[PDB]
C-alpha cells in the first residue's frame, strides 16, 4: 500500500502531437505530472546531499 516506485505507462496512453507550426508539442497531463515528480525527487536528493 505504501508506494516506493511509480509505474510510468507506455506512450500509447500518453499521446503526443508534434505541432510543427510552432516550437512546441501537445502533451498530456500525466507526462507533466511525472516530470514534476522526477524534478521533486532530484531536488530532494540535492537537498539531502
Amino acid at each position: 500500500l505504501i508506494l516506493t516506485r511509480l509505474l510510468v505507462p507506455p506512450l500509447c496512453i500518453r499521446p503526443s502531437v508534434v505541432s510543427d507550426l510552432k516550437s512546441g508539442t501537445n502533451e498530456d497531463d500525466l507526462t507533466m505530472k511525472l516530470t514534476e515528480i522526477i524534478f521533486l525527487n532530484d531536488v530532494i536528493k540535492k537537498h539531502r546531499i
Binding site: 524534478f39 532530484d42 531536488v43 536528493k45 540535492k46
Partner: protein, 86 residues
C-alpha cells in the same frame, strides 16, 4: 536548481564502509564444523522426507540391486492423533 542526470544510478552503488571481518577463534571454527556436520547428517536422517519418485520407465532384474533401502522411524501413535495413521 538540481542538475539533470542522463544515465540512471548504478544498480549497486559503492559504499565507503565495508563489513567488519568475522570473529576468529577455535569456538567459531568448531561451531562452523558442527553446523556443516549437521547439514550433512540431517539430509540422510529418516525425518528428511524426499520427493517420492514416480513414473518409472520399466521394471528390470537389477531393481532389487538398485532398490534404495533405509530404516523408517515409527511415530508414537499414542501421542499422535489417529488422523495420521497410514
Amino acid at each position: 536548481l538540481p542538475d539533470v542526470v542522463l544515465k540512471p544510478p548504478p544498480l549497486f552503488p559503492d559504499t565507503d564502509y565495508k563489513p567488519v571481518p568475522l570473529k576468529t577463534g577455535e569456538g567459531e571454527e568448531y561451531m562452523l564444523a558442527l553446523k556443516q556436520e549437521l547439514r550433512e547428517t540431517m539430509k540422510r536422517m529418516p525425518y528428511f522426507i524426499e520427493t517420492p519418485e514416480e513414473r518409472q520407465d520399466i521394471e528390470r532384474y537389477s531393481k532389487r540391486y538398485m532398490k534404495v533401502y533405509k530404516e523408517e522411524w515409527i511415530p508414537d501413535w499414542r501421542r499422535l492423533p489417529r488422523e495420521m495413521m497410514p
